[PDB]
Amino acid sequence: KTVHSASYDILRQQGLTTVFGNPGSNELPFLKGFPEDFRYILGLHEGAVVGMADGFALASGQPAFVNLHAAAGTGNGMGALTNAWYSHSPLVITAGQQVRSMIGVEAMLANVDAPQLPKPLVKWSAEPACAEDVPRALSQAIHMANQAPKGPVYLSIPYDDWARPAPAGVEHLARRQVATAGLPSAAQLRSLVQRLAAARNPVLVLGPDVDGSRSNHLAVQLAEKLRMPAWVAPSASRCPFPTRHPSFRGVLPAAIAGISRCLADHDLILVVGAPVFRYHQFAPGDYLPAGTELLHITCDPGEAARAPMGDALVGDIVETLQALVWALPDCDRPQPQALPPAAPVEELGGLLRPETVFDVIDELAPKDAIYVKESTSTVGAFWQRVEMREPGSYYFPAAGGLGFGLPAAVGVQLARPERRVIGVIGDGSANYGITALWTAAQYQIPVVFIILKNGTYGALRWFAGVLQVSDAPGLDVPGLDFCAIGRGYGVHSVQANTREAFAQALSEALAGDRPVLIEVPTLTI
Amino acid sequence: KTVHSASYDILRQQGLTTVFGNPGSNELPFLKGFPEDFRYILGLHEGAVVGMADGFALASGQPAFVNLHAAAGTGNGMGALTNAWYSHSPLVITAGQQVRSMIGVEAMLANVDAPQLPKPLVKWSAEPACAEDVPRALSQAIHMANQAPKGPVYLSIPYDDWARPAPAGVEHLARRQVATAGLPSAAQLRSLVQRLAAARNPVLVLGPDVDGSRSNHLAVQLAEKLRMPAWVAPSASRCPFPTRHPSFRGVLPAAIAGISRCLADHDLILVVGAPVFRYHQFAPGDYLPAGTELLHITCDPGEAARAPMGDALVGDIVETLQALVWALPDCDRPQPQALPPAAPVEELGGLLRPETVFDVIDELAPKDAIYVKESTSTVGAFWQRVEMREPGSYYFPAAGGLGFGLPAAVGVQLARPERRVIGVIGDGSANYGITALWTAAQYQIPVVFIILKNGTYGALRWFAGVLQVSDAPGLDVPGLDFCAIGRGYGVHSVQANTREAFAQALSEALAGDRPVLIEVPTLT
């Protein structure tokens, strides 16, 4: 037995049998003898590697294993880690290191002070002090990433470690289970029941950990038991509730003053599975309406600690909601009434309007499609127009780090081969993760990649207009041909200029079993 | 006066008037009122932004200014910082931060613990404690990046700072000069002279800081003064010596046993402007030949401290070399004789060999072309076949981080518009920095981008053989059409399958003033 055999035994028994990577010489001794029951997914750039792994871990509900090259490979993946942090993504990131005797002299490919490199975007990082501790360190990595609050971890491994003999006692590691006890106490449950049942007009607010914990159906039961509306917490990264349910109200605005206005008539706000709150725009005002109280249920002690208001309970979301639904009384206030349907937009005679594209998607897509969205000026219209009825149907970068979309679509589609993934990606956002197209071609992962091509960084032009700034450089992205780029990376590509051409292209893509890129020139104002 | 007006005044007076960036909302208050005498170079991904700035700083010999978005933009640029670290590149990296009152709550776009993010790849990192300290902190960043050993620094700026009034006393900052005194003392100089003059058979070994300090001509003078051969230090990132000068001996192998074998006959080794040594492959053996001594001249205290052998002198390389050339006595030993030229490789009639491509480059390229190389299995052949006569003629990623090549070619070409830049890039390496093609097209930066397309991560096949690994996944890169990708980003693109087709494409590219991508299918 070697450090190598012991390590692959640990990965197999813990279920980490898909490796997302881009290889280098320090990693070859790990990749040696790669087992026939494991799968390796090559990305051409590490931002795409990490984002594929992120999508895979989130959609599968299991940890994902990554293998990168030394400091430059780790570095190229670091933007993608910002999103993985706020999505509570359990990524086990390994990077290969020089031989131990060559690290201090700073030989070429030595990753200097390796554990510091990924900080502060990892929950744990190490470089084992000896070859013999590597298998236990890898066990520690997997169980740190997969415990609440879940998140990325990092391990740097000198390449001469793998061939060394495994130590006595290593046989205990592969079978280890780490379980998290997160049910409320009887007193804690009583407090939630008393406060909710006593409220005049409560409201529900739901974040990405409602989807991550598979609590969507429980959230519907909760809303119905208290006859209350349900919103998505601001800066939404996942969809936690069926969007045409009559209690649904949309996504809250990412603004201090905006949330206290939207929720002004409610005496009690219950936030589940989000921070309080991922505000974005500067909009000073009241954190809460006068007389309103807030309750917060979260899996993350740091979310509970940092909130500017409310009483928090930190624990297991699905067990907490199940207990709460059981313990609450029925209510006979009237049921909330549904939001009105979105009207078609006016025909203006220029390029296709995003609203039009979305109406077509809502008509032709399967009702359990999965959407991966990274198109920053069209978010409001998408949520209004594209129904998302089932869990696990939406992914948007949780840190707002662009380059998530194309790679995450490939990883999500790999995790959920029985559903169809449709990416809705801007011309700007596409270029941060463009080589994911190639991985989709090579492995025949049949994402429908829709590129909305408006010629600009539209969301930034909007924000610039708001600040009366007209002199900022760098906001336009002319001269891009995504059909040529798609074909370059091996993906069947088509340009759709009208509503009829777009419908035909989407229909034909959905009917097939290959990736397709659909380039859609769109209106921007 | 505002923090904004004072900061642009500092950048202007210090000479940082080109901004390399990718914008975001936290940066819009900085980019507001961008001055007419500044230039903004947009990159579509931050790895390319930082690589362009890196090339520009190295080729211009001046610091370069970067503006990135928050933590995700900073993160996307961090692979490029590995290279900037080992090339001693003076990059001033700014990243926009949320409004100060929204940082601790972790609002969307808050960069948490920002100064820790780029570590350990920056020599100084800060987030100012108040708006009034932003101008002085920017000055500190500039003067930290540009003092020996030069390197990247990082400043995180909350976006509500820019509009605030500038503090009293700010007017002293823009004019500040920071000079480095780095000449050897009389005793230090005499020790080098005494030792070198007493040696039986000295040898010279030169690294990237010889090119960086503009000491190439002095290195030739020194070699000639001691009638000694000259090598490039291993893991070469720049070219410090004219490669057809008769004392030139090529690049040392990146191997412990290799160096002591190559240099076996020399009693004294003088290493200038490189670490001792950037070994790569694991080839254990003797650090030095028995009886040999090593002298080291470096601009970097860390290089001096970490070396496993030798006596080091840390200071100003160009000033130290000039003092040494002046002080050395006459030497009567015969001059070294030139290396024999490379033999032709016989064409087997099918896909082109890289050696053939390099012979055509050597025939047709201007004799002061600049090469940006990131083609990992073809480095030895390149150095054997493509003459580099002038300073500032070669750039290869100093940390080996791929994605340097396409972006750095663009930045070098921007720094040196009077010379012509030829990028020599593999099919694997191109994809880590591919959006640099777009910036070349948009700004009409006329790089000749040559893509060597062998279908594989060729150098990893070599290392797999060395390490005795035969079943590793992920070594092949089939199914890439770089003419389609080039055209997609706006660059005129042509495929060249034969020696004649490549000559014609290279000649036409060189005769024009637009960027061109030339895709060349090659044998491994």
Ligand SMILES: Cc1ncc(C[n+]2csc(CCOP(=O)(O)OP(=O)(O)O)c2C)c(N)n1
């Ligand atoms: C890595 C990274 N760099 C820069 C930004 C800043 N950013 C925010 S929105 C945006 C524009 C995206 O444009 P596009 O995807 O074309 O969508 P549109 O706004 O045009 O709808 C940019 C560049 C970011 N969020 N992430």
Ligand SMILES: Cc1ncc(C[n+]2csc(CCOP(=O)(O)OP(=O)(O)O)c2C)c(N)n1
């Ligand atoms: C960012 C990064 N990721 C991975 C590697 C590992 N790496 C070393 S050489 C190499 C292959 C480069 O292939 P190519 O540019 O096609 O050149 P060839 O070896 O085929 O001549 C790779 C992937 C690296 N050095 N940098």
Ligand code: NA
């Ligand atoms: Na756009």
Ligand code: NA
């Ligand atoms: Na290659």
